[PDB]
Each structure stands twice: as structure tokens, then as C-alpha cells.
């Protein structure tokens, strides 16, 4: 359900995190930030590259 979407988001955030050369704690910080943002229903239907890049950019 929603956990599969957060798993896909965690894999994409893992990809952008290990590609952008950031440490491992800020990956979990961006993950909980994306979880809070999706709890606030901030965006839908994007290609998700811009979304994960923007969340990792603010984190």
C-alpha cells in the first residue's frame, strides 16, 4: 500500500544520496522529512526525480 510507495521513495532517495555523496544520517533525515511532507500531502503525480532532489536539497 503506502509502505510500498515509501519503499520506492527510500530506494530513490538512497540512489540520489549515494550519487550526490552525502552521509548516511542525512538520508534518514530526508526520509523523515519526505514522510512528514507526504503526511501533509505536498505533491502528487510527478516524475519524482525533481521531488526527491528537492527534498534532498532542503535536507
Amino acid at each position: 500500500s503506502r509502505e510500498a510507495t515509501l519503499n520506492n521513495a527510500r530506494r530513490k532517495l538512497r540512489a540520489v544520496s549515494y550519487a550526490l555523496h552525502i552521509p548516511e544520517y542525512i538520508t534518514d533525515a530526508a526520509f523523515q522529512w519526505y514522510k512528514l511532507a507526504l503526511a501533509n500531502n505536498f505533491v502528487q503525480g510527478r516524475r519524482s526525480q525533481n521531488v526527491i532532489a528537492s527534498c534532498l536539497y532542503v535536507a
Partner: protein, 763 residues
């Protein structure tokens, strides 16, 4: 000066040229020089389903080179990397193409992940440094190497020992299990061999992907040459003492009435399952041909199915000799039936699967990108390699920091590969290396793979074994040793065709069982006569001729064959060649040696020493001393004390003891406190016991002079009165001396570290 009685200065020259610990360094250097560049050519084409134009193509791969600048411009220093809790690594560099433009192909040269490199190798800092770079690098110039720091600690890849691969090993049981088993490898298929016997004469080929059984008289008549007379004549012998026992299971080709047209394939493979897809790919010949070729033998045999026929025909010639001859068995404890894998082969088998698990995910990313009406992928192919670059590094560090190597093509789980490096003493750091671990680790069997065999004179140490449950399984390895690597078996076989052999295209007769037939590690080439002249010619060619350099030949008279072993993994030891009158000292060779020229790796060119430990020496005769020669010999032994290992090499007069006390003392000699390294006061270790006032051994064994143990001792010297004093001297109960122990006798330094990394959270 010496005339002929020295016989000793070959071992320091050997230790200076090659060295003691080379079971990891030489194998890893051969890996990063040949195999890391070779196995990438087998996986270079990454063609996709969508948009059938895109490809990469690997043309070059190398470790830590960066061929514009220097090697890394840091190549993070090893003792600093041990304290920083970093892995000691140097990255990968590759050269690849693209399909960037409509008419443009880029040749961008990128990197893919990091890779650990063991110390003292080619691609390291600590190669060829002597108290200046050693002093600036802040580490001891006496460590054995063969290890690499991963995640703060350092791990040592143990030398794994398994059985042989392309051989036919004999087994036995209580008159029912006369199974003539084997294994095989075409680098992706082992799965079985299971040549078991159920009824007398009935030695049906078993398999796991088959229902019941397949007879020999239909295998040798279907996928072998068919005559129904050579099965009495070619495979069993001429005299009736063997054929009268082999008379059963020769009428089975007449009982079921098979008589090969295509039903001799249909009956042997109507019982095999899972035919690879839903096409039903047999087409009354196909799965039978591929089951003959690839899943049961190491030869592809594209046109002539007769070499595998003669291989099975000589395999079944031993099980008849396991029945008529009252139970002679080549047991699976002899060293000639034993090949061991090194650190390079294990790290290659790791890398060849982790590269596949990288490439499949990268192809998945390519297929994820190419799925939109946007412009074609120019630069995201140039990019998006440092997004799965942390799959080779993280996996390559995890599999060496844990020790459980999951592979998706061989289907095994290997546990307990490495070990944390114990630094109780310098003897511990030398003897935990050069260790032969095994596969029979936890099994309570007496007098099996626990009792040592007489084929260990110079091969392995006969006194180095820790007492307990692992007694006879983790024994170490001797000093004068070398391990063969395999170049190629094809020029060797062609040179055998040059030296006067016939092939297996014209040799079917009753004269197959004349004088000894030549082999190449599990493949017969020809039943040649005049065996001593062939061995003499190759004896002259291994010293004078062009390319042999690692080949053991030996004539076995009981099974009436002669073999040639060329696979990699067997052990060696140097020995002096004699010719019927004298040795090869001759008053000038060792004189030129200790004058300051003509070192090792030149005495093989002239013909003095030649390192070997296979059953070549079983077809030989080795002398002990100078005053023991007989004019019928082959070789002699250089030093007699090369049988004891390095951990058994500090015992003063070991031959004046019984063997259990030597075994106990060599087991507990890598346990005492000492003077581990020169950076003793500049390192941080998790468990480090230190000696305060170390002193030399008063008596020196002639092996600890060479391993610099006199420089770095592991104890203390003391006079001692052997008497029964005060009743405190009952059963290994010593009594010390106040005001002698008060002056610094046996003072200890126990060092424990406590690292608490402070981390910032994701909050």
C-alpha cells in the same frame, strides 16, 4: 671457505627473492595484473530491449593508476587509515564507449567504486621502502602483509583447501558403496558426478535431475563409439580375470534391445526434467546432446564424442580394479589428490558475481530511463555510473568484513573465510598467515582427515596444530614452498604432440593396455610405449626447453598410466638434481652465490634446484645428506629442517622431544606476550599485550635468524635450577623469586581501547 658441506645458503636466497608470505601477495598481484583485466572481457556488451542502438563496451580496466597524474595523489596511508576507521582502498578506472549523438560516440573514462588492496602488493604504498618511507609512513617494516584494513579492523583471507577438481577419486564402503566419484567444472557447472554402484556390474550413472538410473553399456554405446566388443576389450582388459567379473551388465544392451539409432538417446534422457523452456527443446536429439556435453564433463566436444567416451572408459576401468584387486583405494587424503585455492581466486569469485549484480542493476536503470518521448540518453549514460558505484564498494567491503559470500551462480554459502588479525606476538602475526584451513571443520571422525599423512615431508608443518576440536584441520605450511599458478594447458598438450605421441583418433585396439598412456590432468592424449625415454626427454626439457616451468610428470605402475598435472593449487619445495655420480654443489656454484651474484631464479635456469611437491617425488628417490648417495638416484634434499614450520621453528632442539609436547608448544607459541612491531607505542589496538624488557633467545634456531625473531623476541631469559623445592613444585608448578621479579622480570603491558564515536542524529 666451504668446499661442499654448506648446503644452507639456498634458503636465505629463496627468502630474499620470493619470501615467506607469498600465498597472498603473489596471488593478489597476479589477480590485479591478469584476471581483473581478463574477466571484464566476458561481460562488456550491455544491449537493451528498448531502443536497439545503445551499448557500452569495456576496452580497459585497471586499479589505482590514473594514467595522467600519479597513482592516486594520496592513496590513503595504511597506519593512518587504521586509526581513522576507514577502509584501505584504491579505486577502479575503466574506458568505455557510448552512443551519445546521432553520429557521435564518446570515449569518456570514468571510475566505478572503490576496492581494497592488501599490503605489500604491487598497487600499494609500502612496496620497496626502507626506513625512510617506512619512518614517514609510521608503520613497522617487518609485517608479513597479505591483509587489508576494512572498517578500522583488518582481515586476513585464509588459504582455503578443497579436494581436486579434474580427477577421479576412489571411495569405498561395506561391499556396496564402491562408488567411483568425481567432480568437474566448465567454470559454471559442478552439480554432481555420482558414479555409484547398486548391483554387481550395475554401476549406473546417477544425477539429481534424473529419475532412476542409466547403465554404462548404453552410455559407452550411445555417446561413445559402439562395437559391443570393445566394451569387453578396450575398457576392462585382455585377460579373462576381469572380463569374467565384467560379464554382468554387458548383455543389458541386448536385454532392453536399444542398439543405437536415436532411442539410445531417448532412453537415457526421457527421464530428465525441466527442458529449459516451453519449446520442448529435445527435438529427439538436443537435450541429449547438451546433457552429454555440458552438464557432466569439462569438454565441449563439438563434433567428436570420443574423448569423453575414453574418459568414462578409463573411469570405469578403476571400479573393476576396485572389485577384482581386493580393495585398493586412492583415498582423499593424499596431497596429489588435493588442490588449494588462494586469496586471489576467492576475491575473483567474489568480483565476478558482484560485477554481474552491478551490471544487471545498471541495465535496469538504462531501461528505466529509455521510456519517454524525450530526447535520447546522451549524458545520463555518461552519468549514472556513480549511482550504482556504491554496490561494488559496499558489497566488496561487507563480504570481507562479515565472511558470508552469497553468490547467485554457484549456489553456496561460505562461512568463516577471514579472521581478525591477532597480535599476541610476532609469531602470531606470522603463523596466522600461511594457514591451510579446510572443509571438514566440524565432524567427529577418527583417523580420517585428522591424522597426518607421510606426504608432508617439506610440504606442510608436521608439528603445527592447535589442540582441541580443530586438531588436524587448520595446520600450517612449511618454509621452502611455492604454489603453482596455471597459464594454459594447450601449448603443453601441443608440445606433448611434438614429443612423439599419437592421438585418440586412431588408437582403438586390444593394444590400448600396453605401456603407460599419457594424460593431461584428466584427459588422455595417447597410449604411448617407451615411457622412461619420454620422462627422460621431458626431464631434460624442464631444465633446457622453452615453456614448461610448472609441470609434474609421474608414472603410476599399478593403474598402468602416466599423468601430467598442470592445474594451479599444488605445493612445491626446492631440491637439488643429481646425475648418477655427484650433487650440484661443485665448489663453484655456492661460491658464486655467496660472493654476491647468481641468486635464486637463476639456479633453475642453470639446473641446480627445482621446486616441486606433487607425486613426481613418488616417482623419484631423494637422499638425506652428502654421504648417502647411491648411483641410481634422482634428487636429494637441501635442508632437513624445512619440514618444521615457522611457529615450530623457534623450538631449541625439537628432535630431542616426543611429538605431543612439540605439538602443544607449537600450538601455544603463538600465544605469549612480546614485542609485536616497531610502532608498538604509536598504535591503538583492541587487545595488545606487551613485553617490557624483551631479550634475545640465548640459543638461536637457524630459522629464527631468518624471520628476524632475534630482532623482535617474545619473552625473557632466566637462569633456572631444576630441583624439587619447598613442595610448591608438584605438577608444572613453578616458583619465582622476589627481588628478581622486582627488577623487571616478566613485566606486562595490557592495552585495551574504548572507542565511542559521537554521531549526530537525523533529528
Amino acid at each position: 671457505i666451504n668446499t661442499a658441506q654448506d648446503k644452507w645458503h639456498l634458503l636465505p636466497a629463496f627468502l630474499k627473492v620470493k619470501g615467506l608470505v607469498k600465498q597472498h601477495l603473489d596471488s593478489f598481484n597476479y589477480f590485479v595484473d591478469t584476471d581483473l583485466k581478463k574477466i571484464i572481457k566476458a561481460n562488456q556488451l550491455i544491449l537493451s530491449d528498448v531502443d536497439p542502438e545503445f551499448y557500452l563496451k569495456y576496452v580497459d580496466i585497471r586499479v589505482g593508476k590514473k594514467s595522467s597524474s600519479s597513482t592516486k595523489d594520496y592513496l590513503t596511508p595504511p597506519h593512518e587509515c587504521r586509526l581513522r576507521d576507514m577502509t584501505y582502498s584504491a579505486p577502479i578506472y575503466v574506458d568505455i564507449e557510448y552512443t551519445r549523438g546521432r553520429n557521435i560516440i564518446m570515449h569518456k573514462d570514468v571510475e566505478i567504486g572503490r576496492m581494497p588492496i592488501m599490503l605489500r602488493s604491487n598497487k600499494c604504498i609500502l612496496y620497496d621502502a626502507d626506513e625512510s618511507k617506512m619512518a614517514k609512513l609510521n608503520e613497522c617494516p617487518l609485517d608479513p602483509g597479505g591483509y587489508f584494513i576494512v572498517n578500522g579492523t583488518e582481515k586476513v583471507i585464509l588459504v582455503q583447501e578443497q579436494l581436486s577438481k579434474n580427477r577421479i577419486i576412489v571411495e569405498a564402503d561395506e561391499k556396496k558403496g564402491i562408488v567411483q566419484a568425481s567432480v568437474t567444472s566448465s567454470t559454471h557447472e559442478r552439480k554432481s558426478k555420482t558414479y555409484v554402484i547398486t548391483k554387481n556390474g550395475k554401476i549406473y550413472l546417477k544425477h539429481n535431475s534424473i529419475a532412476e538410473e542409466i547403465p554404462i553399456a548404453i552410455v559407452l554405446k550411445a555417446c561413445g563409439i559402439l562395437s559391443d566388443l570393445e566394451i569387453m576389450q578396450l575398457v576392462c582388459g585382455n585377460d579373462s580375470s576381469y572380463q569374467d567379473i565384467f560379464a554382468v551388465n554387458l548383455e543389458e544392451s541386448s536385454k532392453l534391445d536399444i542398439y543405437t539409432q536415436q532411442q539410445a538417446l531417448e532412453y537415457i534422457g526421457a527421464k530428465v526434467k525441466t527442458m529449459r523452456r516451453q519449446k520442448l527443446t529435445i527435438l529427439q536429439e538436443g537435450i541429449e546432446a547438451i546433457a552429454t556435453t555440458v552438464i557432466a564433463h569439462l569438454t565441449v566436444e563439438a563434433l567428436d564424442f570420443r574423448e569423453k567416451a575414453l574418459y568414462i572408459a578409463m573411469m570405469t576401468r578403476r571400479v573393476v580394479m576396485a572389485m577384482y584387486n581386493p580393495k585398493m583405494i586412492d583415498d582423499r587424503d593424499y596431497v596429489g589428490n588435493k588442490r588449494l585455492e588462494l586469496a586471489g581466486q576467492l576475491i575473483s569469485l567474489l568480483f565476478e558475481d558482484l560485477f554481474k549484480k552491478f551490471n544487471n542493476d545498471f541495465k535496469l536503470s538504462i531501461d528505466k530511463v529509455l521510456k519517454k518521448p524525450n530526447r535520447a540518453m546522451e549524458y545520463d549514460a555518461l552519468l549514472s555510473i556513480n549511482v550504482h558505484s556504491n554496490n561494488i564498494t559496499s558489497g566488496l567491503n561487507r563480504a570481507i568484513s562479515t565472511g558470508n559470500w552469497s553468490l547467485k551462480r554457484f549456489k553456496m554459502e561460505r562461512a568463516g573465510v577471514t579472521h581478525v588479525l591477532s597480535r599476541l606476538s610476532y609469531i602470531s602475526a606470522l603463523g596466522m598467515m600461511t594457514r591451510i584451513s579446510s572443509q571438514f571443520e566440524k565432524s567427529r571422525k577418527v583417523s580420517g582427515p585428522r591424522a597426518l599423512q607421510p606426504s608432508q615431508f617439506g610440504m606442510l608443518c608436521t608439528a603445527d596444530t592447535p589442540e582441541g576440536e580443530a586438531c588436524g584441520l587448520v595446520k600450517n605450511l612449511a618454509l621452502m614452498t611455492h604454489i603453482t599458478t596455471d597459464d594454459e594447458e594447450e601449448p603443453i598438450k601441443k608440445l606433448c604432440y611434438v614429443l612423439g605421441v599419437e592421438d585418440i583418433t586412431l588408437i582403438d585396439s586390444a593394444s590400448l593396455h600396453l605401456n603407460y598412456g599419457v594424460y593431461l590432468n584428466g584427459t588422455l592424449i595417447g597410449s604411448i610405449r617407451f615411457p622412461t625415454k619420454f620422462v627422460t626427454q621431458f626431464r631434460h626439457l624442464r631444465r633446457t626447453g622453452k615453456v614448461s616451468e610448472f609441470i609434474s610428470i609421474y608414472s603410476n605402475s599399478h593403474q598402468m598410466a602416466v599423468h601430467i598435472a598442470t592445474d594451479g593449487g599444488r605445493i612445491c619445495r626446492p631440491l637439488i638434481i643429481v646425475s648418477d655420480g655427484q650433487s650440484r654443489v661443485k665448489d663453484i656454484h655456492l661460491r658464486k652465490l655467496l660472493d654476491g651474484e647468481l641468486d635464486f631464479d637463476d639456479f633453475l635456469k642453470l639446473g641446480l634446484v627445482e621446486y616441486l611437491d606433487v607425486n613426481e617425488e613418488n616417482d623419484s628417490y631423494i637422499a638425506l645428506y652428502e654421504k648417502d648417495i647411491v648411483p641410481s638416484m634422482t634428487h636429494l634434499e637441501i635442508e632437513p629442517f624445512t619440514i618444521l614450520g615457522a611457529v615450530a621453528g623457534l623450538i631449541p632442539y625439537p628432535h630431542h622431544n616426543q611429538s605431543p609436547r612439540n605439538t602443544y608448544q607449537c600450538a601455544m607459541g603463538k600465544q605469549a606476550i612480546g614485542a609485536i612491531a616497531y610502532n608498538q607505542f604509536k598504535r591503538i589496538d583492541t587487545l595488545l599485550y606487551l613485553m617490557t624488557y624483551p631479550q634475545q633467545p640465548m640459543v638461536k634456531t637457524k630459522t629464527i635468524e631468518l624471520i628476524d625473531y632475534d630482532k623482535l623476541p617474545a619473552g625473557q631469559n632466566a637462569t633456572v635450577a631444576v630441583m624439587s623445592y619447598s613442595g610448591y613444585d608438584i605438577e608444572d608448578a613453578l616458583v619465582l623469586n622476589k627481588s628478581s621479579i622486582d627488577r623487571g622480570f616478566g613485566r606486562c603491558e595490557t592495552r585495551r581501547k574504548t572507542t565511542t564515536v559521537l554521531k549526530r542524529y537525523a533529528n
